[PDB]
Amino acid sequence: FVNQHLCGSHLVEALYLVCGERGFFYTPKT
Amino acid sequence: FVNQHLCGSHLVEALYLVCGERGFFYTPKT
Amino acid sequence: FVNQHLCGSHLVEALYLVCGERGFFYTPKT
Amino acid sequence: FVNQHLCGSHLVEALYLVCGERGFFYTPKT
Amino acid sequence: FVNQHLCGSHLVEALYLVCGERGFFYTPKT
Amino acid sequence: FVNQHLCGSHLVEALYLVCGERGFFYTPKT
Amino acid sequence: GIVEQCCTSICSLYQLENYCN
Amino acid sequence: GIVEQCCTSICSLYQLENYCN
Amino acid sequence: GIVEQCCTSICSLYQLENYCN
Amino acid sequence: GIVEQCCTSICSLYQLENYCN
Amino acid sequence: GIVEQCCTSICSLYQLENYCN
Amino acid sequence: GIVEQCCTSICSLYQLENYCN
Numbered sequence: 001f002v003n004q005h006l007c008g009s010h011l012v013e014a015l016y017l018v019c020g021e022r023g024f025f026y027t028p029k030t
Numbered sequence: 031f032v033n034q035h036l037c038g039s040h041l042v043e044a045l046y047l048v049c050g051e052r053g054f055f056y057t058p059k060t
Numbered sequence: 061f062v063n064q065h066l067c068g069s070h071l072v073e074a075l076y077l078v079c080g081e082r083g084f085f086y087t088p089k090t
Numbered sequence: 091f092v093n094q095h096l097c098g099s100h101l102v103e104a105l106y107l108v109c110g111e112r113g114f115f116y117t118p119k120t
Numbered sequence: 121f122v123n124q125h126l127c128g129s130h131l132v133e134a135l136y137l138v139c140g141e142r143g144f145f146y147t148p149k150t
Numbered sequence: 151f152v153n154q155h156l157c158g159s160h161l162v163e164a165l166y167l168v169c170g171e172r173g174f175f176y177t178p179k180t
Numbered sequence: 181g182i183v184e185q186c187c188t189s190i191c192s193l194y195q196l197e198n199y200c201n
Numbered sequence: 202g203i204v205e206q207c208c209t210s211i212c213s214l215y216q217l218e219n220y221c222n
Numbered sequence: 223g224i225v226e227q228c229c230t231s232i233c234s235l236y237q238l239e240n241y242c243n
Numbered sequence: 244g245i246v247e248q249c250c251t252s253i254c255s256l257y258q259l260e261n262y263c264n
Numbered sequence: 265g266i267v268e269q270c271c272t273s274i275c276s277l278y279q280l281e282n283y284c285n
Numbered sequence: 286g287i288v289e290q291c292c293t294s295i296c297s298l299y300q301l302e303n304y305c306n
């Protein structure tokens with residue numbers, strides 16, 4: 001796999017691809 | 031705002047839009 | 061809802077989520 | 091260019107690509 | 121058609137819209 | 151990483167994520 | 181869960197606020 | 202409408218130009 | 223307008239409702 | 244091909260590496 | 265090439281046709 | 286954290302696995 005540069009909704013898309021229907025937590029700060 | 035079918039990556043995109051900075055959990059095994 | 065920072069196709073995605081199958085007009089300038 | 095099925099958010103993405111600066115209307119109740 | 125300003129995954133989306141199920145090659149450099 | 155159904159533009163998005171700089175080929179007529 | 185409320189059934193953006201952290 | 206031409210039936214990018222403003 | 227405000231500064235989902243049918 | 248492995252059947256990100264250039 | 269031109273400057277949909285099968 | 290690292294610098298898909306259920 002290549003390293004990832006992901007901002008905003010593109011990170012959320014990547015999380016879905018990695019985790020799928022297992023699910024995931026999107027946990028940014030302030 | 032309307033009621034529509036949001037599934038898969040479209041549902042997580044909708045969560046990001048609504049929650050954003052706050053974060054969210056996508057747990058479809060619940 | 062959180063405030064939105066949306067450019068290009070991401071705004072169009074947000075419009076679809078808000079309006080759905082009611083439909084919408086995407087009306088930028090020049 | 092090919093003929094394919096464009097539905098929902100994918101259809102509005104295709105409209106943005108083709109029309110962009112000009113703008114567009116997505117009116118599926120027509 | 122309008123001219124396109126497309127980076128990262130947005131270009132890949134445009135390639136899919138143009139080529140469809142014919143398929144395409146995504147060929148960047150280094 | 152999970153096994154899930156990736157189709158159409160979602161599949162090419164997944165290819166971009168995994169391959170990125172390397173590039174990829176999407177040839178569904180194979 | 182969320183899949184049943186929003187994907188199988190339909191839901192608004194208000195209902196999506198329920199799954200914010 | 203657009204759903205019938207492009208989602209139910211199929212359409213090209215040329216047909217999508219019809220819905221530009 | 224709305225398109226430029228959302229990108230240059232910020233906008234709300236309630237402002238986007240104005241552009242629905 | 245890729246459609247059969249990943250769209251019709253299911254596949255992981257490891258299997259998607261096969262289609263990198 | 266094409267990938268860099270589309271992002272750094274602009275490209276057309278007709279230029280993108282060159283990379284289809 | 287992870288969200289900021291992926292955007293400001295880079296992250297790997299293996300780092301993203303940590304946030305799955």
Ligand SMILES: [Cl-]
């Ligand atoms: Cl972007």
Ligand SMILES: [Cl-]
């Ligand atoms: Cl879909």
Ligand SMILES: [Zn+2]
Binds near residue numbers: 010070130
């Ligand atoms: Zn983007």
Ligand SMILES: [Zn+2]
Binds near residue numbers: 040100160
């Ligand atoms: Zn989709």
